[PDB]
């Protein structure tokens, strides 16, 4: 599919056919595809100071404004923001700084990071190791040493016979605790998780998961890294997924909706517990020996600022919350469709996992075929979704209205009816 242009929630192919971009591109184009104020911010900044770096005691106005704004918006108290170009680089730098921090605290053995199966955190050698999907690892010799993976919190696929949702949450927290014990708790630096796993299939954790996991972490004083690359800036019904799931991270990683992907920029926030010992170590060494050339890029930072100003002025968090409520309700009305195994989601993100045998939870051979089949029909009906195996994902822009949500979910129902007719 060759996409050429976009407008609001829509994109157009070269032939002129219009689609709802129900993924907001790559989970990221929050303000839609034609926000003129972002081009205005970019052009203005690029003619004033198109580039300056933030190395060696240098700065500029856009990065200063954006650092202040991100710290001020944090869902828990934070101390500093640090800027990169991507989500992958941010998670990579986070891992490195955790290792530095542990060295800075006299803990040379506290270097292990716990991630999760089906988690997605990037593509660098380190951040692809954090990622818990098989194809990111296969043939790349990953994961690197120090990166561990605990279970995926996906009740529909991991729950045991007869187990309840809250028991499943208890079992995942207990399995985490067993992992920490078996490794040696003093060796565990951090735990990383997305509030809701996006790329892994829009996996919403079971109720009480994050409370119980945080209890475990807190017992051993392990750092929590909230990966808000997808969930950040209104996706889940609040400004951050950490608010929606009552998470209290030490480190919060952002990208994507930060600039609505109009330019490459990413950031993470660290609290005082993280910052203070890194600062002291940088002073003994003489510098903090990391950073990307374009870290804090002034044009990207100007666009991000204007993007956040628009999300606040137009009440887009609330807009996403309310259209999300409607979308979640509409999608769950398809539960009794013969092809619908599970509907899951919160706020303005959802997944619909397709099956041909509800009791066995199985689809066509191989798993993925059913999702590919339905996704082709859905596209043909004017809706671009992402297939993750047999799950179709929905993550539309924050500017969507109810009428557009109705259009998108009706196309999904007509799609599933079509696919059902092809198989009978």
Ligand X SMILES: Cc1ncc(COP(=O)(O)O)c(CN)c1O
Applying the rule CB under 6 A, the residues between 59 and 88 that interact with ligand X are 86-88
Given a contact cutoff of 8 angstroms between Cβ atoms, the answer to whether 212 and 169 are in contact is yes
**Residue 332, number of CB atoms within 10 A of its CB:** 15
Q: Is residue 141 a contact residue for a copy of itself (CB under 8 A)?
A: yes
Helices (H), 187-246: 209-219, 241-244
According to the binding rule CB under 8 A, does residue 139 interact with a copy of itself? yes
Q: Does 135 bind a copy of itself (CB under 8 A)?
A: yes
Q: Is 292 in the site for a copy of itself (CB under 8 A)?
A: yes
If one asks whether residue 229 binds ligand X (CB under 6 A), the answer comes out as: yes
- Cβ contact 253:228 at 8 Å: yes
To ligand X, the closest distance from the beta carbon of 251 in angstroms equals 13
Tell the smallest beta-carbon distance from residue 59 to ligand X (Å): 17
Query: How far from each other are the two terminal CA atoms of the chain, in whole angstroms?
Result: 29
- Tell me the chain's radius of gyration from C-alpha atoms: 22
Closest CA to 168 of 156, 155, 178, 179: 155
Which segment (61-69, 174-182, 191-199, 409-417) binds ligand X by CB under 6 A? 191-199
Q: Is 194 in the site for ligand X (CB under 6 A)?
A: yes
Q: Which helix (H) or strand (E) holds 279?
A: helix 272-285
Residue 343 interaction partner, one of a copy of itself, ligand X, none, beta carbon < 5-8 Å per kind: none
The rounded distance, in Å, linking the Cα atoms of 36 and 34 is 6
Residue 422 CA to residue 166 CA, distance in Å, equals: 38
C-alpha–C-alpha distance, residues 50 and 95, integer Å: 30
Among 204, 278, 304, 308, binds a copy of itself (CB under 8 A): 278
63 or 374: whose CB is closer to a copy of itself? 63
The C-alpha atoms of residue 75 and residue 312 are separated, in whole angstroms, by: 15
Q: Determine the interface stretch with a copy of itself among 215-223, 273-281, 312-320, 400-408 (rule: CB under 8 A).
A: 273-281
Residue 1 touching a copy of itself (CB under 8 A)? yes
- Nearest-approach distance from CB 369 to ligand X, in angstroms: 24
CB 383 within 8 A of CB 22: yes
Closest distance to ligand X from the beta carbon of 139 (Å)? 20
CA 48 to chain centre: 33
225 neighbors 188 (Cβ within 8 angstroms): no
Nearest distance in Å: CB 316, ligand X? 19
Task: Say which entry of ligand X, a copy of itself, none residue 194 contacts (CB below 5 to 8 A, set by partner kind).
Answer: ligand X
Q: Which is nearer to a copy of itself, 294 or 355 (CB)?
A: 294
CA 383 to the chain's CA centroid: 22
Cβ proximity of 401 and 419 under 8 Å: no
345 sits in the region (left: phi over 0; alpha: psi -120 to 50; else beta) called: left
C-beta of 172 vs 388, nearer to a copy of itself? 388
Among 223, 300, 317, 416, binds a copy of itself (CB under 8 A): 300
Min CB(403)–ligand X separation in Å: 28
Q: Which of 84/404 has CB closer to ligand X?
A: 84
Within positions 155 to 194, which residues make up the interface with a copy of itself, using CB under 8 A?
A: none
Q: Report d(CA 135, CA 330) in Å as an integer.
A: 33
Footprint on residues 17-76 left by a copy of itself (CB under 8 A):
25-26, 28-29, 33-36, 38-40, 42-43, 46-61, 63-65, 67-68, 70-71
Name residues contacting ligand X, limited to 10-29 (CB under 6 A). 26
Cβ atoms of 10 and 18 within 8 Å: the answer is yes
Residue 3 φ then ψ, to 5° = -90, 135
Taking residue 224's Cβ as centre, other Cβ atoms within 10 Å add up to 21
Element (H, E) at 296: none
Q: Which is nearer to a copy of itself, 245 or 275 (CB)?
A: 275
Report the residue number, 24 or 214, with the smaller CB distance to a copy of itself: 24
Chosen residue from 24, 129, 236, 255 binding ligand X by CB under 6 A: 255
Q: What is the residue whose two structure tokens read 């619909």?
A: 352
- In terms of CB distance, is 177 or 227 closer to ligand X? 227
The one of a copy of itself, ligand X, none whose footprint includes residue 190, by CB under 5 to 8 A per kind, is none
Stretch 389-418 residues interacting with a copy of itself (CB under 8 A): none
- Residue 121 interacting with ligand X (CB under 6 A): yes
Which residues lie near ligand X (CB under 6 A)?
Answer: 26, 86-88, 91, 120-123, 194, 198-199, 227, 229-230, 255, 292-293
């Amino acid at each position: 599919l060759v996409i050429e242009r976009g407008d609001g929630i829509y994109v157009e192919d070269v032939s002129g056919k219009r689609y709802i971009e129900a993924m907001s591109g790559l989970w990221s184009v929050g303000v839609g595809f034609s926000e003129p104020r972002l081009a205005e911010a970019a052009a203005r900044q690029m003619k004033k100071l198109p580039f300056y770096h933030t190395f060696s005691y240098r700065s500029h106005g856009p990065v200063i404004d954006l650092a202040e704004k991100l710290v001020s918006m944090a869902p828990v108290p934070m101390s500093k923001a640090y800027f990169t170009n991507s989500g992958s680089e941010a998670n990579d730098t986070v891992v490195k700084l955790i290792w530095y921090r542990s060295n800075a605290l006299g803990e040379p053995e506290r270097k292990k990071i716990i991630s999760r199966k089906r988690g997605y955190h990037g593509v660098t050698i380190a951040s692809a190791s954090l990622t818990g999907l098989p194809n990111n690892h296969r043939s790349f010799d990953l994961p690197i040493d120090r990166i561990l993976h605990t279970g995926c919190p996906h009740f529909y696929r991991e729950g045991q016979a007869g187990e309840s949702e809250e028991q499943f949450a208890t079992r995942l927290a207990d399995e985490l605790e067993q992992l920490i014990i078996a490794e040696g708790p003093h060796t565990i630096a951090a735990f990383i998780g997305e509030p809701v796993m996006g790329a892994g299939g829009v996996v919403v954790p079971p109720k009480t998961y994050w409370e119980k996991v945080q209890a475990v972490l807190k017992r051993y004083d392990i750092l929590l890294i909230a990966d808000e690359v997808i969930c950040g800036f209104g996706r889940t019904g609040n400004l951050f997924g950490s608010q929606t799931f009552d998470m209290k991270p030490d480190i919060l990683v952002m990208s994507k909706q930060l600039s609505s992907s109009y330019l490459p920029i990413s950031a993470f926030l660290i609290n005082e517990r993280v910052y203070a010992p890194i600062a002291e170590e940088s002073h003994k060494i003489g510098t903090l020996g990391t950073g990307f050339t374009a870290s804090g890029h002034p044009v990207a930072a100007a666009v991000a600022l204007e993007n956040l100003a628009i999300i606040e002025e137009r009440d887009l968090v609330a807009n996403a919350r309310d259209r999300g409520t409607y979308m979640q309700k509409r999608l769950r009305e398809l539960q009794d469709h013969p092809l619908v195994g599970e509907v899951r989601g919160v706020g303005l993100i959802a997944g619909v996992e397709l099956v041909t045998d509800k009791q066995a939870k199985t689809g066509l051979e191989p798993t993925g075929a059913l999702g590919a089949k339905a996704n082709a029909v859905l596209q043909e009906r004017g809706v671009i979704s992402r297939a993750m195996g047999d799950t179709l994902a929905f993550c539309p822009p924050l500017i969507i209205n109810d009428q557009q949500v109705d259009t998108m979910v009706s196309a999904l129902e007509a799609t599933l009816n079509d696919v059902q007719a092809s198989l009978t």
